[PDB]
Design a protein around this ligand. Sequence first.
Ligand SMILES: CC(C)C[C@H](N)C(=O)O
Ligand SMILES: [Mg+2]
Ligand SMILES: [Zn+2]
Length: 849
Amino acid sequence: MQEHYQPAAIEPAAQKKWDDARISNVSEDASKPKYYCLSMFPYPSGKLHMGHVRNYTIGDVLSRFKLLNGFNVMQPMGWDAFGMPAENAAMKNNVAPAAWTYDNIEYMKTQLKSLGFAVDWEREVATCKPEYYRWEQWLFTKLFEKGIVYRKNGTVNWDPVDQTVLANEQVIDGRGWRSGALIEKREIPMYYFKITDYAEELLNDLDKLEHWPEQVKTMQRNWIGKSRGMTVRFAVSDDSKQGLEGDYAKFLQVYTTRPDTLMGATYVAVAAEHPLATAAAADKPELQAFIAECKAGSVAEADMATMEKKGVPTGRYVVNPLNGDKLEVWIANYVLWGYGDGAVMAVPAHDERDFEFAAKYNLPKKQVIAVGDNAFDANRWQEWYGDKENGVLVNSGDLDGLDFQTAFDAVAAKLQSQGAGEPKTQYRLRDWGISRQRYWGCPIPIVHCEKCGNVPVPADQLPVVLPENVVPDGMGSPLAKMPEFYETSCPCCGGAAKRETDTMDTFIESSWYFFRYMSPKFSDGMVSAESAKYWGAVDQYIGGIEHAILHLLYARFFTKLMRDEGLVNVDEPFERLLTQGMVVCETYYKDWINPADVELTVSAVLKADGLPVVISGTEKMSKSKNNGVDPQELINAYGADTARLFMMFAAPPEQSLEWSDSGVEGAHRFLRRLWRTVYEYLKQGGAVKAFAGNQDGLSKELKDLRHKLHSTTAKVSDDYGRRQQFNTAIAAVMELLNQYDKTDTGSEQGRAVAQEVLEAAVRLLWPIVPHICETLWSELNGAKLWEAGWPTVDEAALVKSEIKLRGKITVAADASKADLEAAALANEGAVKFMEGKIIVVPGRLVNIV
Ligand SMILES: CC(C)C[C@H](N)C(=O)O
Ligand SMILES: [Mg+2]
Ligand SMILES: [Zn+2]
């Protein structure tokens, strides 16, 4: 054994031992219980960043822990390789996006192998390869046949200068980004997943996920936005039919989730495109201007709640079918023409938005809900104005006194009798548009034929191959200009036809890749049933909260689609879910300087020029402030184990991790100490059989150390398995070593206990720093570490020794105050001096007066 810790020595050899042993290359082995630990696979955008290293070390700790508990553990990796990164690099460097990701793949793959993650590289996928995306094309056509995917016209943001479609985030103040020209909204045919059909199943199944963090389930429910409310029809007043045609001359229909407050509607509001809006806007020019100002506007959800609510009166009127009030119809910029009806009611007394609107315009407010003896101020919104649970109706005539749900059922009753109303479920969830006017993406398997329409490619012809020898210019979609690509035959009639040229939302790959890992070379379908039956569902998923909504929702949706196709039998893909916290680092600068390029003394200056540089604040490692710390700088300088140890110890996984030079140093020093402990131990005796069995007759000191050992093993087992707090687990192992350091392990029995401590410590840290632990282990013991398995808790080591003057009794050391006092009134010498308060002094006397 060398005296000095050399990570650059032992880390490649350990990996080679693990590789040669093929401990991570696993099959569908019924001779072992399966465990599927999955980390969110990366975009091959170039190199790894500290976020990758944190995410994948967390998954590897969990994987290795289950491995040492004998599970058949699959920890797969692969490349989410479609998207804009490559397309952008293709413009920047005149290289094909394929060639640019593959170069990133083989680099990041050796970068990951370098870190020693216990990963089944035989299960590696790359989503940008035909043998992968052919299967999402296949499912696309299957669902397109059933109408679960359909074609309809949707609006997009067209930049008439950059000449492509822009995302609703890449538009700034109504204009483009790299062009900044006035966006043209254009109606183009597009493909959708009918995810609304699965809304209720996606909502209700969340309850099955007892091991998901509730916030993620909460975020998923709010995005689906189920509501149980009422459709309500308002008779258009006789004087207000001027210009109204058809069923819009008859009634204004709105949706509401507070029909219990229908007696409080003081006006109504219609979208800019509403027939009543435009029928009023004929002879009134200022309404036509308002309608145009609304049309020329963003529709971003974030822009909507942070928007000055604006309305205009119309002079048209409708009648509330409950109390006969005459209510003016306003046009308002918060009403959207597409979400159910194009119009809402407004109850300012019990809806804050309606309250601020009515306070701006001096519109009336009618309190119809009261909450106990709560005073009500018409010029002061308070939280209880919107109480759906602790309210009963007031100023509502024959509806006074009912709670929400009783008044709900009564208003439904009253409205249905008149026919003017019916209950209705609604969801904010829209359908999932998957078409992208982009090159580097899965081609959409549809061929357009003038005779046969939009026909899907037969399963025999799949894949529709994306040509890789392309360098997109950003001035269009190169597929739509490649006749050698889009020109084809019709599969139904054999005549001239053109392929679809849009590609798919790259969320499509990440929506089913966890199943493909079960059989990534299977050629007869998405996933062989043999592997799907064995692996079932992902036992543990690890990723960032940036995917808690859309990616998880799409992954769950694809699971239930794939189930309903009979490809899998699970309903939900991820049982356990762990959200990694982000990694932050200080920034340095008008001109942001990578920290490794900086000499930071109290002060801080450049690394080259040596001139004073500005030490700015601390934030997520990014490119916007050039504070990403390349983990390759970390591995070269301290080894992989120091890197993994630093991030697992710096903070709990869910919490943000602050980069720290002294932190990495400490991690490396602790590994240096762990190395020296074993070396010093073997220098004065060499290996011996670890202590085991009855510990009676061990000295008090060695007994305590065995107590500290097996209590540590229980707490590290708990921190790995249930709490998933790896920082406290590492702390506990440091506490054991500290007590060991203070324990005279010189005797024969002392060396046996010392051997027990060390053999447990290296196995307890192996999930975090396996390179040094694998090395130290084989220097302590000749068996395979993975075959010796996770250390067991010796519960005997946890039982600590037991503790007129009438007599003396023996009680336990962890006894109760009633435990000692109970034996006092049953002692022989006690009853002899008692003849039919009890001052119990723990550790001395228990006198009974
Ligand atoms: C699960 C995937 C959506 C993860 C994604 N490829 C990422 O690197 O963030
Ligand atoms: Mg269950
Ligand atoms: Zn045809």
